[PDB]
Design a protein around this ligand. Structure first.
Ligand SMILES: C/C=C1/CN[C@@H]1C(=O)O
Ligand SMILES: C/C=C1/CN[C@@H]1C(=O)O
Ligand SMILES: [Fe+2]
Ligand SMILES: [Fe+2]
Ligand SMILES: [Fe+2]
Lengths: 260, 268
């Protein structure tokens, strides 16, 4: 006795989940980050650096708090009989976390560094943040570490989901929806960073983190498969609404930084 | 501002660790389960089934509580800033426990069923418990689910290490050391289970779970003792390391008693 909801109640949860993402204005043509990334003629080192620092911290927290949420679910399953449908969905979350922690998918391990240098927030720090940091003053660099409030609110939302047995499903459900558009926006943003009139990212291989995410998302037991009763279903939709809105406000904050 | 202990102080913790494993009597020649598995001549369907049920629940709890311990460490790392050598040993936990959940390593991915049927406690249930179950009575299947006290005490400790930031490191450092001996014990024991006159497990493929473990668990033991990306590489201060040895003692001890419980059931 433990199993997913029937496939009809689950499909309704998926449709309500898609509607929360619509209402949060996270779609490609909605969110100020994707619009700005398309619209701006150029991007200063300071602005690109700041956005890169915020992203580094957001993706580090996304990965660790998603794994923590999986652990919370594992605590439960240690003392229940999860059926095989449930276990398949648990495996999926594990496999997906593995992309960011160890480049599990072949599209990542074909280009990412091995060992801890390949952890996505570290690989980002090494190849995106550090070259930008060479073109900003030490005072600029300390200011960027002072995260804006919408970024702090999102990290606080992730800390709360780290304890939630549905937390890893909520986070992956939303992030996988928007990951493609974020990575395309980064490709465009850092393609437009000029320092000495010369591009800061002038070599193809410097975009390897971004192009790998674009490739993986283009090609890439779903997340509602971890919902085991009606009350959890309601809780899932509620956490998706909160989490999606915080993501949208954090990306609007990227967009704001690139404009005005 | 987070890093492991210096190499010297770590290889010292590694030595105190291998010594608590010694004292615990978990070595190939000191634990009653490994001796009995080799020594006994025959094992009844009912006795082999009972141990198979116990092992199912023990390994199920090991995987999930070790995963939960990794989650509790992740929750810490989301707040702090772990240097790369810490992150490296973190990756090892994810990689090692990942085989029980996903059969990533090549020894397993060849033979393991795909998807959830390959989860190791499920694969054990399907290929060891179930064939035995067909040769025991309903009352035997009921009685085997009521776990003996030494097994329950181990499970209860895993439930506590599940919320411990050092919990995955403790459990993997001990279990991966003894895993090979346990798997070799099971190969002996379930070769000697006879029902109706002849063995329950006749074909070589019926040992797939055990055989794959005998091969793979050599490298897993080497992964948890590696002096760069090994389990003591997750210890960040001298106090934490003291807690590590306290918990390894507790855990190696409960693992030894639980395994002796297997041996007694096999002998009488
Ligand atoms: C934060 C979401 C992401 C998809 N994997 C990306 C990363 O590593 O940043
Ligand atoms: C319990 C320890 C083990 C090594 N992996 C084995 C299993 O799945 O049982
Ligand atoms: Fe990633
Ligand atoms: Fe295993
Ligand atoms: Fe192992």
């Amino acid at each position: 006795p433990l199993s997913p909801l029937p496939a009809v109640a689950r499909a309704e949860l998926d449709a309500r989940t898609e509607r929360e993402i619509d209402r949060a204005r996270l779609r490609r043509a909605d969110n100020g980050f994707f619009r700005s990334a398309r619209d701006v003629e150029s991007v200063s080192p300071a602005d690109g650096h700041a956005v890169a620092v915020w992203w580094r911290q957001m993706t580090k927290a996304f990965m660790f708090t998603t794994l923590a949420g999986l652990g919370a679910l594992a605590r439960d399953y240690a003392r229940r009989d999860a059926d095989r449908e449930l276990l398949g969905a648990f495996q999926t979350v594990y496999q997906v976390i593995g992309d960011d922690l160890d480049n599990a998918a072949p599209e990542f391990s074909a280009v990412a560094p091995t060992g801890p240098a390949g952890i996505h927030y570290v690989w980002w720090d090494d190849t995106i943040v550090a070259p930008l940091a060479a073109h900003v003053t030490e005072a600029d660099r300390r200011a960027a570490e002072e995260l804006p409030a919408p970024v702090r609110e999102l990290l606080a939302a992730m800390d709360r989901l780290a304890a939630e047995p549905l937390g890893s499903a909520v986070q992956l459900r939303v992030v996988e929806t928007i990951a493609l558009d974020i990575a395309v926006g980064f490709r465009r943003v850092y393609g437009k960073v000029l320092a000495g009139g010369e591009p800061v990212f002038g070599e193809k291989d410097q975009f390897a983190w971004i192009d790998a995410h674009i490739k993986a998302e283009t090609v890439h037991t779903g997340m509602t498969g971890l919902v085991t009763d009606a009350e959890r279903g309601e809780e899932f939709v509620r956490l998706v609404e909160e989490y999606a809105g915080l993501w949208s406000a954090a990306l609007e904050c990227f967009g704001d930084r690139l404009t005005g």
